[PDB]
Design a protein around this ligand. Sequence first.
Ligand SMILES: Nc1ncnc2c1ncn2[C@@H]1O[C@H](CSCC[C@H](N)C(=O)O)[C@@H](O)[C@H]1O
Length: 229
Amino acid sequence: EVQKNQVLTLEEWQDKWVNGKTAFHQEQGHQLLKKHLDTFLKGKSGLRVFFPLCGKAVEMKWFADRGHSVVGVEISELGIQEFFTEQNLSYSEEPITEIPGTKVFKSSSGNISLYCCSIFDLPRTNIGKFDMIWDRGALVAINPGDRKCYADTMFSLLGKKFQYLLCVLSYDPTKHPGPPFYVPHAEIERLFGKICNIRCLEKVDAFEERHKSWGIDCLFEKLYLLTEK
Ligand SMILES: Nc1ncnc2c1ncn2[C@@H]1O[C@H](CSCC[C@H](N)C(=O)O)[C@@H](O)[C@H]1O
């Protein structure tokens, strides 16, 4: 409960993009996902995959290239345009009618749609249900107090059977206030334990030189696989 009162605003996240402060972005993609990708998609085709707080995650293309439909939500229009530019994809726009002033960016390929609004606006849209969710730099970027609402929101997006892939970071919360925030095993059990079977697939050192700016000297990444209980 040390970071419990941290409250970031959407304007602050949008400013990080405008100012180029996006060190969370991994150009080569998540290595743990890469390792387990073939197993998670074994025997499946044409899945609908959701990427909350997607930024310009290259992993979205990995799924689209394998025949799966991808939907993401990101508050920064700049981040979304950077995704299309870097993946060399053309796109067109459409209004999100239920949330005046916002838009959804759709690739010409028809395989990727990026909603440019808040994840908390989604329940009021017709985004529908998903077979799979890839959550990295998402549950851990959400204001601590908003996590229960975030979890409830995610559940309303899931189909009967699903695979919720979740990445969280393990570090001493008294040394760095976040983001990304500290989401311990207990918090995952509190937020998802009633509805999901929880499996911790991997735990690996993720400390990089850039992390010294956080004031920590230790950093571990854990990959969880949550499925219908
Ligand atoms: N409430 C909210 N709704 C939608 N997007 C949000 C949001 N709060 C933060 N974001 C966006 O959340 C992202 C978190 S960092 C994103 C990283 C991306 N998932 C990756 O793995 O590289 C930022 O791009 C930020 O602009």
